Ligand binder design. Structure first.
Ligand SMILES: CCCCCCCCCCCCCCCCCC(=O)OC[C@H](CO[C@@H]1O[C@H](CO[C@H]2O[C@H](CO)[C@H](O)[C@H](O)[C@H]2O)[C@H](O)[C@H](O)[C@H]1O)OC(=O)CCCCCCCCCCCCCCCCC
Ligand SMILES: CCCCCCCCCCCCCCCCCC(=O)OC[C@H](CO[C@@H]1O[C@H](CO[C@H]2O[C@H](CO)[C@H](O)[C@H](O)[C@H]2O)[C@H](O)[C@H](O)[C@H]1O)OC(=O)CCCCCCCCCCCCCCCCC
Ligand code: CLA
Ligand code: CLA
Ligand code: CLA
Ligand SMILES: C=Cc1c(C)c2cc3nc(c4c5[nH]c(cc6nc(cc1[nH]2)C(C)=C6CC)c(C)c5C(=O)[C@@H]4C(=O)OC)[C@@H](CCC(=O)OC/C=C(\C)CCC[C@H](C)CCC[C@H](C)CCCC(C)C)[C@@H]3C
Ligand SMILES: CCCCCCCCCCCCCCCC(=O)OC[C@H](COP(=O)(O)OC[C@@H](O)CO)OC(=O)CCCCCCCCCCCCCCC
Ligand SMILES: CC1=C(/C=C/C(C)=C/C=C/C(C)=C/C=C/C=C(C)/C=C/C=C(C)/C=C/C2=C(C)CCCC2(C)C)C(C)(C)CCC1
Ligand SMILES: CC1=C(/C=C/C(C)=C/C=C/C(C)=C/C=C/C=C(C)/C=C/C=C(C)/C=C/C2=C(C)CCCC2(C)C)C(C)(C)CCC1
Ligand SMILES: CC1=C(/C=C/C(C)=C/C=C/C(C)=C/C=C/C=C(C)/C=C/C=C(C)/C=C/C2=C(C)CCCC2(C)C)C(C)(C)CCC1
Ligand SMILES: CC1=C(/C=C/C(C)=C/C=C/C(C)=C/C=C/C=C(C)/C=C/C=C(C)/C=C/C2=C(C)CCCC2(C)C)C(C)(C)CCC1
Ligand code: OEX
Ligand SMILES: [Cl-]
Ligand SMILES: [Cl-]
Ligand SMILES: [Fe+2]
Lengths: 82, 30, 451, 334, 36, 37, 62, 341, 30
């Protein structure tokens, strides 16, 4: 039967539907685009940029080796990139 | 250059859906 | 609603081409239109390969499957397989692509505008699937058309240029064939060879004379079978053996196509005569033999006596005996001692590889070919990283022999499934229980229990 | 009638406890030769020089194996793809040394199982059934053809077919991952989705039909006696299992057509096992799993490993150890 | 309630994904992750 | 390379071989049009 | 005449494109089976001639 | 009407997506397990935990992205965002592996929620809860593989990371360190999954090829009304077919669908037990009798000894980079290798 | 003794096959 809601085939063929979402969808796409194009996603999540995996002449990985000094450990490897 | 690539395929690909669109206006024989 | 809905034809949309079984005219449209697409692709693809072709790279470094087919027929190519004129490729391409539009035109005509059914418009082009005489008549015409096709190939080899002969001396050249082989002891000897190692059935055909000869035979066989069938009707024994329906005929041809795809798969993988390695890259066996050659040459240059070098296992490190005693390359490549190619045969004597020829007569073109083929061995990843599975990214290569073999095994497998599907269904349909079991007559219910 | 007709009518009798049929005429002898040989070799066959390097692998129980380690060992690499019937050997001793039972077993077996497939069609015809069960069996059959026939062909040797053994199978899989990165191949990914999905849908359907058995028994007897063989009626409430399952997810992710539901059960595992049989068949021609080794590099050019590089380190460990005495030259090109 | 035919939204949607995925397969050969 | 005469058609030539796959897709556009009757 | 060869060759493409869309619509529209009989017949001769015309011009520029 | 009963009314309403009391556990935890997987595979690295890229941002594709396990140096920390390690710093929590525990633990409570939901819906609809019972096997698998196994090991590092190729690595780790293929509990699991798929295919194919003719078209899907009394296919003809093809057949439709539940559910449970074993390195790695012979008889070779040699290759070639926190340094000369390769 | 044990269990299973097929409970239609 029908739980009672408006059928989907009915909403997405409606114009009012596409009036609303011809804006919001592309907008969300652009928001997410910008999230990465602003470089903002890098600093939120702490993800290295292609130039920040290593120091210029270092060949070893900033692996974390302490449970409680770990936050401090990551912060000090970041200082050693400048 | 690659817009040439995309513009040709843009038009080639829409040619199909369009035929169906035309024959539907004309109450054509789909 | 001329068929075209599920209510009238009995078939849903996902099986809608079954709506055409007894609509000879629309069905004619679909075949030609589809023939349209095949010739289209032959055309578009060739021009795409031409637009992407650099004559300085081997054909096989460039991802080409069709131009190598054109080069094998002796167009646009010189000694060693060097590309000397690209214009013939362009012609093959344009003509097919052009042709596809007339094909295109004709199929879309018949599928839409033309008569849905033909049998009242002309007694000759109309047909009924159950008309045993009319069916062998169509079969007969197409046999003759195929017979002609095979003779076009003879015609190109004997009168219109020749074929590329990888075995022609001076590293291979285009060559006219003048003594095709007609001895049926050879031509049909091939069909009687084992398909197993060292024999290879018809995949072993290693010279153009045998190829051209075999197409004379098959061309005349086909033409003579066309006539036979146009004039005859199936005899009692054949009538009682088969299902006479449109679906059954389809299932018999899916059967044939499957068989053929599988033979093609092995042809392109093992055969380096009508798939010259100049164009297609080396075979799997050829590459592996080429590596043994490469390191024989290098070590011997350093001072190694390669005939007396005992490797770790006790077997020769470079040379050993096949199980029938032939001298063959050692190491894992022992499995590939059946390989034959123009770069390697100069070193062969009556007992296999000849050590005096190894120590004295290896030319630098053989070192080059052997090094080239060992580093273009048909190994590569789906995304076209070349080499073994553990190779690093760098080389963008997958052998045309891999592409053509994998693709055609896949296609042959699914056409075997198509056979069983439509063969099974043809039998049920003919017997009348393809839509299921009759409740009022369920056959098992009249049968005695098994126990 | 005449003698030949009596025989034909017996061969095709739908009254024999086991259906024979024309396919059965070939199947029975070939499976029997394959089964007798295999059973005897598994127990008593002497060591087999699989890799052609005069380094024989013991596969049989009497030569120090157990059920898990035992195998009928693939024939010699020296043989490659040559046919090696018993009559081609100078002696049984030679034939055993070189792995002849393997060839005899798998040829008779492929042949016997192909006719088994045909036999499935044949009896469905004599019984008035629809015919496509045999199509379902084609997925398992094709899988067998791949490890026993196609993969040897592309690689040039039955020495690289799958061994007839529990640990031999594992050997085959490991060497396959290192030589083809089969885990990174989509057709094998499709095989896993095939068999996980098949197992999932098996458990779902069984659980869903079982959930909706109609009370026809008491709490002391087996629910199973609520169903009598050949009973006209259904013994579960599909409406009720749709109602349960449509609510578990939502109404239309659930089936209410028994036929569509059952065709989905057939098709999911068959398709995916087709793809993974096709995966072994195309890697047989060295079209291998995706390679992303050193696919990420940084602004200077350092390799930034990903999980694909870690898989490669494992792969490489298999590569360099497998058949440790069999390679003289730096690439394992088959 | 049904002013835009469904097949139309279908084709549009499809060409929508076809594009986005095409982009991702393109990205496998360009910039980050291309081995280059 | 094509003959330089047809160089200007290189981008249309790059796309031509995928055209036959659109025919398959065009069939589904068509049956959605007739509503999979 | 490098200029008259590219002329004709687009005449083929623009005409192909027209005929590719137009011929199927024409066919399954019942009204102008006669209004359009002429169109496609003429486009067709136009198409064919143009192939030939491009086909000969190639041999003055290719 | 008490307020509890009013809330029960709303939660158990017939809507397009049923909520229930179970939903209060189910939907938040599932959305965040999901969402955290999507977030981590899209944007988060494994650089400080593993020396690895693991997100689309870094240029990984769908096969190579992962939410990777936290560093071995974390032990078995819950890795709470407000906990001693990350101290409420969301950026640092991503970099130290918090999302892994975040996914692992919400995912676990989500599975609970899902099973409770199966119970809740069965009870209101009036059906037996064999489906919830069936879902016990995925739960045993998840719990055994993602929780028990690392809790037995040195840390969460060695649990599976959440990625396509990460899981492939885990398979291969398990071959080369645990010799998992040789473990009868996995072998029972293999049998139950491949046997489940067999039952799945053979039962669907049998139904579709013993249908009664209940309509008149060639699309046989339309000849079924879910309210019909009648069996849509013939148990009788199915039984004869399989008795004659295979020797034996099902005759009882109830046992048949019960057996379909049992086989794969029982196999996943056996596999789980074996992984509990491996939590402790309690492996079926060796056959002692083979090793005593092998060590004394250099001509004795079996597929068992050949596979251990492979295992040794995997361990040594893959460990330095797979367990970077160990600072394994293996000079070329110690790396086991056959000839030439 | 281990070889004999594996062969004995295997032989029992092959006998089981026999009885399971030929001495099954006959299915009947009630
Ligand atoms: C109805 C039909 C029923 C018929 C059943 C009874 C027939 C039995 C046939 C068995 C086929 C298996 C043997 C194939 C093994 C093999 O070596 O086959 C390969 C041979 C080619 O043989 C190779 O051929 C080579 C020829 O090359 C030689 O000659 C060449 C000349 O250029 C080159 O020089 C090359 O260097 C040189 O070596 C060599 O002779 C090799 O040693 C030899 O291995 O191919 C062949 O004959 C072509 C056909 C191969 C068989 C097709 C595979 C079938 C796939 C099964 C699909 C399963 C379907 C799913 C089921 C579910
Ligand atoms: C089935 C139904 C499904 C229901 C599933 C629903 C999911 C519920 C959520 C589960 C929560 C799991 C987190 C458990 C954390 C854990 O264990 O965390 C581990 C900690 C112990 O910490 C570890 O302890 C180790 C031992 O250290 C000790 O030993 C050292 C010796 O050198 C030093 O002395 C050191 O100072 C001292 O602490 C190391 O320090 C490790 O690095 C450190 O991680 O225990 C603790 O939290 C508590 C230990 C009490 C046991 C808790 C029972 C549950 C765990 C099951 C374990 C049995 C299975 C494993 C089999 C093996
Ligand atoms: C497209 C190709 C094709 C097809 C589909 C057919 C189809 C048919 N032919 Mg025709 N035929 C063809 C080409 C073809 N023919 C050609 C080219 C010739 C000339 C050589 C003939 C000569 C010919 C004759 C003389 C006869 C047929 C007959 C028939 C009918 C029965 C076929 C039959 O029993 O198959 C084969 C099925 C069998 C059961 C045959 C059993 C023999 C074994 C099992 C098969 C192998 C035989 C093969 C010759 C040797 C194998 C080679 C090996 C080394 C690989 C059927 C309509 C018969 C008929 O009714 O004619 C009017 C008949 O008598 N055909
Ligand atoms: C090679 C592919 C192929 C071909 C050739 C056909 C051909 C045919 N189909 Mg099948 N079909 C296919 C794939 C194919 N189909 C697939 C993949 C599906 C599954 C979705 C179906 C599902 C299906 C159903 C459900 C039915 C058919 C039917 C038909 C027939 C009549 C179609 C009709 O009325 O069109 C009407 C459509 C139109 C008028 C719209 C436009 C169509 C034209 C052909 C487009 C041409 C485009 C092209 C670019 C033209 C320019 C080239 C020119 C310059 C040369 C026709 C013979 C029908 C049938 O059997 O009739 C009884 C039918 O009912 N088919
Ligand atoms: C196998 C393909 C095939 C078949 C069997 C038919 C059969 C038929 N068509 Mg179709 N048709 C086809 C392809 C096909 N056509 C193609 C490709 C086109 C587009 C070019 C057309 C366009 C078309 C139209 C527009 C009409 C028909 C009509 C007819 C009917 C009359 C045929 C006639 O009088 O020809 C008589 C035969 C000749 C005059 C012989 C000359 C034909 C050529 C030049 C022979 C050359 C053969 C060639 C060299 C071999 C190689 C071909 C290629 C593969 C390389 C008949 C049912 C008519 C119809 O249905 O009436 C209502 C109709 O009006 N057809
Ligand atoms: C890899 C294989 C596999 C997967 C992916 C899977 C998945 C599923 N099975 C379900 C059900 C079932 N599975 C069953 C038996 C089985 N299921 C099996 C194997 C699988 N089952 C097998 C082999 C069996 C045989 C016994 C039964 C009997 C059922 C059901 O009744 C039920 C159903 O309706 O399915 C049709 C669904 C539970 C829905 C749910 O919990 O939503 C809620 C989602 C939650 C709580 C989030 C979980 C978070 C997970 C655990 C961790 C994070 C995962 C990341 C988001 C993604 C990581 C991806 C990388 C690993 C690549 C879900 C579709
Ligand atoms: C069968 C294969 C399965 C795929 C389904 C095929 C649908 C095809 C179907 O049969 O018909 C489509 C179905 C019916 O649509 P309506 O009745 O709205 O439209 C009528 C139209 O068919 C008229 O054209 O619509 C939906 O179900 C859309 C699904 C949206 C689902 C929203 C998901 C959000 C819920 C969150 C996830 C669930 C949580 C689970 C519990 C935690
Ligand atoms: C050669 C040439 C040419 C021609 C071309 C052609 C011939 C074209 C065609 C084209 C085509 C042929 C097109 C088509 C298209 C198609 C499309 C693009 C489609 C898509 C699809 C989709 C997307 C769908 C969707 C859906 C539906 C509807 C339903 C279900 C779901 C889905 C999603 C599936 C020209 C002129 C240029 C000139 C030059 C050269
Ligand atoms: C029926 C039908 C169908 C089908 C269809 C078909 C299959 C089609 C075909 C068709 C075709 C088959 C077409 C053709 C086309 C062609 C064209 C249109 C061509 C043209 C060309 C050109 C124009 C060229 C030019 C050039 C040159 C010369 C040189 C270089 C450059 C270029 C390339 C530019 C479908 C399924 C869809 C649907 C339903 C119905
Ligand atoms: C070109 C060439 C050549 C030649 C070729 C030839 C000469 C071949 C032929 C071919 C042939 C000569 C084949 C035949 C075929 C056969 C078949 C394929 C058969 C089939 C059969 C069937 C199918 C049957 C069935 C049945 C039975 C048995 C019983 C009853 C039922 C039925 C009828 C179903 C060579 C190699 C020198 C070189 C290269 C190129
Ligand atoms: C974690 C976290 C959180 C949460 C989060 C979440 C909630 C998230 C969300 C997220 C999401 C929710 C996401 C989503 C996304 C999705 C995606 C990414 C999609 C994509 C897909 C695709 C790409 C697909 C496509 C395709 C394919 C591939 C094939 C087939 C076809 C199709 C078209 C389907 C919070 C806040 C608490 C904070 C803390 C942490
Ligand atoms: O044998 Mn069995 O495994 Ca196929 O790669 Mn080459 O060969 Mn041997 O090495 Mn790796
Ligand atoms: Cl090995
Ligand atoms: Cl080697
Ligand atoms: Fe069922």
């Amino acid at each position: 039967g029908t739980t009672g809601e408006r059928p989907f085939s009915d909403i997405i063929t409606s114009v009012r539907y596409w009036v609303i979402h011809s804006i919001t969808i592309p907008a969300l796409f652009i928001a997410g685009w910008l999230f990465v194009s602003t470089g903002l996603a890098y600093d939120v999540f702490g993800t290295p940029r292609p130039d920040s995996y290593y120091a210029q002449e270092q060949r070893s990985i900033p692996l974390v080796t302490d449970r409680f000094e770990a936050k401090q450990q990551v912060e000090t490897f970041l200082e050693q990139l400048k | 250059e690659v817009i040439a690539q995309l513009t040709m395929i843009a038009m080639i690909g829409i040619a199909g859906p369009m035929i169906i669109f035309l024959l539907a206006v004309r109450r054509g024989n789909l | 609603a001329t068929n075209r809905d599920q209510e009238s034809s009995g078939f849903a949309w996902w099986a809608g081409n079954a709506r055409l079984i007894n609509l000879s005219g629309k069905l004619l449209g679909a075949h030609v239109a589809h023939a349209g697409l095949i010739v289209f692709w032959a055309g578009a693809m060739t021009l795409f390969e031409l637009a992407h072709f650099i004559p300085e790279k081997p054909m096989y470094e460039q991802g080409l499957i069709l131009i190598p087919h054109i080069a094998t027929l002796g167009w646009g190519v010189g000694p060693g397989g060097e590309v000397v004129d690209t214009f013939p490729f362009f012609v093959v391409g344009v003509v097919h692509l052009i042709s596809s539009a007339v094909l295109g035109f004709g199929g879309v005509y018949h599928a839409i505008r033309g008569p849905e059914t033909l049998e009242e418009y002309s007694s000759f082009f109309g047909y009924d699937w159950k008309d045993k005489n009319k069916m062998t008549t169509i079969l007969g015409f197409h046999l003759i058309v195929l017979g002609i096709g095979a003779l076009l190939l003879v015609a190109k080899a004997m009168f219109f240029g020749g074929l590329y002969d990888t075995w022609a001396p001076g590293g291979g050249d285009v060559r006219v064939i003048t003594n095709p082989t007609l001895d049926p002891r050879v031509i049909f000897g091939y069909l009687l060879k084992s398909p197993f190692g060292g024999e290879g059935w018809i995949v072993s055909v290693n010279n153009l004379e045998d190829v051209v000869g075999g197409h004379i035979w098959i061309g005349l066989i086909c033409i003579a079978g066309g006539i036979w069938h146009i004039l005859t009707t199936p005899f009692g024994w054949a009538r009682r053996a088969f299902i006479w329906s449109g679906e059954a005929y389809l299932s018999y041809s899916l059967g044939a196509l499957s068989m053929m795809g599988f033979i093609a798969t092995c042809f392109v993988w093992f055969n380096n005569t009508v798939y010259p390695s100049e164009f297609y890259g080396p075979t799997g066996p050829e590459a592996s033999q080429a590596q043994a050659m490469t390191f024989l040459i290098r070590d011997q240059k350093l001072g190694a006596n390669v005939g007396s070098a005992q490797g770790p296992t006790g077997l020769g490190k470079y040379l050993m005996r096949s199980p029938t005693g032939e001298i063959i390359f050692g190491g894992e490549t022992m499995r590939f001692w059946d390989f034959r190619g123009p770069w390697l045969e100069p070193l062969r004597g009556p007992n296999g590889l000849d050590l005096n020829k190894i120590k004295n007569d290896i030319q630098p073109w053989q070192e080059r070919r052997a090094a080239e083929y060992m580093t273009h061995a048909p190994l590569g990843s789906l995304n076209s990283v070349g080499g073994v599975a553990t190779e690093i990214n760098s080389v963008n290569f997958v052998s045309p022999r891999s592409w053509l073999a994998t693709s055609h095994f896949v296609l042959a497998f699914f056409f075997l499934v198509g056979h069983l599907w439509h063969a099974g269904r043809a039998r049920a349909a003919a017997a009348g229980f393809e839509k299921g079991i009759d409740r009022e007559s369920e056959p098992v219910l009249s049968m005695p229990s098994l126990d | 009638a005449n003698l030949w007709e009596r025989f034909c009518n017996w061969v095709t009798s739908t009254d024999n406890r086991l259906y024979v049929g024309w396919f059965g005429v070939i199947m029975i002898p070939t499976l029997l030769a394959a089964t007798i040989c295999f059973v005897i070799a598994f127990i008593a066959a002497p060591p087999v020089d699989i890799d052609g390097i005069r380094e024989p692998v013991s596969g049989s129980l009497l030569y120090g194996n157990n059920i898990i380690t035992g195998a009928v060992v693939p024939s010699s690499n020296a043989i490659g793809l040559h046919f090696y019937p018993i009559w081609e050997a100078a002696s049984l001793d030679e034939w055993l040394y070189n792995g002849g039972p393997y060839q005899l077993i798998i040829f008779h077996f492929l042949l016997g199982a192909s006719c088994y497939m045909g036999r499935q069609w044949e009896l469905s015809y004599r019984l008035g059934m629809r015919p496509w069960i045999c199509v379902a069996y084609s997925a398992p059959l094709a899988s067998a053809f791949a490890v026993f026939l196609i993969y040897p062909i592309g690689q040039g040797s039955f020495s690289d077919g799958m061994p007839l053994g529990i640990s031999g199978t594992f050997n085959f899989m490991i060497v396959f991952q290192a030589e083809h990165n089969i885990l990174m191949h989509p057709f094998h990914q499709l095989g896993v989705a095939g068999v996980f999905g098949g197992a999932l849908f098996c458990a779902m359907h069984g659980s869903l039909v079982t959930s909706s058995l109609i009370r026809e028994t008491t709490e002391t007897e087996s629910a199973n006696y609520g169903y009598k063989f050949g009973q006209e009626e259904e013994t579960y409430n599909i409406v009720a299992a749709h109602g349960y399952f449509g609510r578990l997810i939502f109404q239309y992710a659930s089936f209410n057509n028994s036929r569509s539901l059952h065709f989905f059960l057939a098709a999911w595992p068959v398709v995916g096992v087709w793809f993974t049989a096709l995966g072994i068949s195309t890697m047989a021609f060295n079209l291998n799993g995706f390679n992303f080794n050193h696919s990420v590099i940084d602004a200077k050019g350092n390799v930034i490993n990903t999980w694909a590089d870690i898989i490669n380190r494992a792969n490489l460990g298999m590569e360099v150890m497998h058949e440790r005495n069999a390679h003289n030259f730096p690439l394992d090109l088959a | 309630g049904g002013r835009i035919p469904l097949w139309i939204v279908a084709t549009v949607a499809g060409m929508g994904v076809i594009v986005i995925v095409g982009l991702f397969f393109y990205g496998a050969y360009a910039g980050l992750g291309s081995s280059l | 390379k094509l003959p330089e005469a047809y160089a200007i058609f290189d981008p249309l030539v790059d796309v031509l071989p995928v055209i036959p796959v659109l025919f398959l897709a065009l069939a589904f556009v068509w049956q959605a049009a007739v509503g999979f009757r | 005449m490098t200029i008259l060869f590219q002329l004709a060759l687009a005449a083929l493409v623009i005409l192909s494109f027209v005929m590719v869309i137009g011929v199927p619509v024409a066919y399954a529209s019942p009204q102008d089976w006669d209004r359009s009989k002429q169109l496609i017949f003429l486009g067709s001769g136009l198409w064919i001639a143009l192939v030939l015309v491009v086909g000969v011009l190639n041999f003055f520029v290719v | 009407r008490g307020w509890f009963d009013i809330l029960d009314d709303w939660l158990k309403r017939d809507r397009f997506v049923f909520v229930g009391w179970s939903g209060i556990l189910l939907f938040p935890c599932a959305y965040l397990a999901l969402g955290g997987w999507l977030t981590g595979t899209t944007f988060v690295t494994s650089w400080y935990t593993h020396g690895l890229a693991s997100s689309y941002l870094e240029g990984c594709n769908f096969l190579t992205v992962a939410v990777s396990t936290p560093a071995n140096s974390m032990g078995h920390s819950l890795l709470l965002l407000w906990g001693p390690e990350a101290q409420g710093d969301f950026t640092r929590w991503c970099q130290l592996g918090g999302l892994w525990t975040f996914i692992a633990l919400h995912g676990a409570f989500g599975l609970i929620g899902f099973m409770l939901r199966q119970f809740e819906i069965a009870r209101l609809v009036g059906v037996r809860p064999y489906n919830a019972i069936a879902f016990s096997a995925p739960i045993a698998v998840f719990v055994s593989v993602f929780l028990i196994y690392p809790l037995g090991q040195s840390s969460w590092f060695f649990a599976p990371s959440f990625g396509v190729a990460a899981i492939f690595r885990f398979l291969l780790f398990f071959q080369g360190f645990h010799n998992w293929t040789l473990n009868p509990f996995h072998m029972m699991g293999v049998a139950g999954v491949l046997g489940g798929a067999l039952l799945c295919a053979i039962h669907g194919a049998t139904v579709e090829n013993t249908l009664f003719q209940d309509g008149e078209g060639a699309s046989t899907f339309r000849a079924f009304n879910p309210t019909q009394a009648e069996e849509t296919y013939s148990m009788v003809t199915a039984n004869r077919f399989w008795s004659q093809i295979f020797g034996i057949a099902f005759s009882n439709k109830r046992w048949l669908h019960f057996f379909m539940l049992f086989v794969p559910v029982t196999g996943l449970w056996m596999s789980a037990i074996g992984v509990v074993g491996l939590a402790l390195n309690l492996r079926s790695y060796d056959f002692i009798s083979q090793e005593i012979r092998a060590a004394e008889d250099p001509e004795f070779e079996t597929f068992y000894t050949k596979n251990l040699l492979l295992n040794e290759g995997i361990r040594a070639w893959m460990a330095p980079q797979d367990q970077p926190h160990e600072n394994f340094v293996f000079p070329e000369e110690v790396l086991p290798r056959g000839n030439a390769l | 003794m281990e070889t004999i044990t594996y062969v004995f269990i295997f032989a029992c299973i092959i006998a089981l096959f026999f009885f399971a097929i030929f001495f099954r409970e006959p299915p009947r239609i009630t």
